[PDB]
Amino acid sequence: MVTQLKSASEYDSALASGDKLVVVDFFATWCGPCKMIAPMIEKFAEQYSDAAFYKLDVDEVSDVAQKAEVSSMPTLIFYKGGKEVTRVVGANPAAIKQAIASNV
């Protein structure tokens, strides 16, 4: 399951996980590719049980989106030990899957 982050607070606690891969999907409700990739992302969460998946609506938690420097949707950011390891800007199934598999 992909837990929606509702505040800056939730976002940050999500990140203090260490060693555990934390993956955040920055999306918008108006964003088409976001919608098309959302089912895939759920599949990936089932497969990669070693990693915690989340999503954050950029129009609800804007401050977090601006501080994470998200300027296109969807943007998947990969954290480990509270630090950004990488990110994928785009509804790119293959790149997202590889990013998860390789950083778990």
Describe the structure.
Helix 2 packs parallel to helix 4 (about 95-104). The chain has a single domain (about 1-104), classed as Glutaredoxin (3-Layer(aba) Sandwich), CATH 3.40.30. Strands 1-3-2-4-5 form a five-stranded mixed β-sheet, sandwiched between helices. It is built from four helices and five strands. The protein has helices at about 10-15, 30-45, 60-65, 95-104, and strands at about 5, 20-25, 50-55, 75-80, 85-90. The protein is about 40% helix and about 30% strand. It is classed as electron transport. Keywords: alpha/beta sandwich, dimer, electron transport. It forms a monomeric assembly. Crystal Structure of Oxidized Form from Saccharomyces cerevisiae.
Strand order of the largest sheet: 1-3-2-4-5
User: What structural class do you assign from the helix and strand content?
Assistant: alpha/beta
Main sheet: strands, sense, barrel: 5 strands, mixed
List how many beta strands DSSP finds: 5
How many structural domains? 1
- In one word, what is the shape? globular
Q: Number of helix segments?
A: 4
Q: In percent terms, what proportion of residues is strand?
A: 25-35%
* N→C terminal distance: 17 Å
Q: What is the CATH superfamily?
A: Glutaredoxin
What percentage of residues falls in helices of 4 or more residues? Answer: 25-40%
CATH structural architecture: 3-Layer(aba) Sandwich
Which CATH top level class fits? Alpha Beta
- Written as H for each helix and E for each strand, in order along the chain, the element string is EHEHEHEEH
Radius of gyration, rounded? 12 Å
- CATH topology group: Glutaredoxin
Family: Belongs to the thioredoxin family.
Site (Contributes to redox potential value): 32-33
Active site: 31, 34
Domain Thioredoxin: 2-104
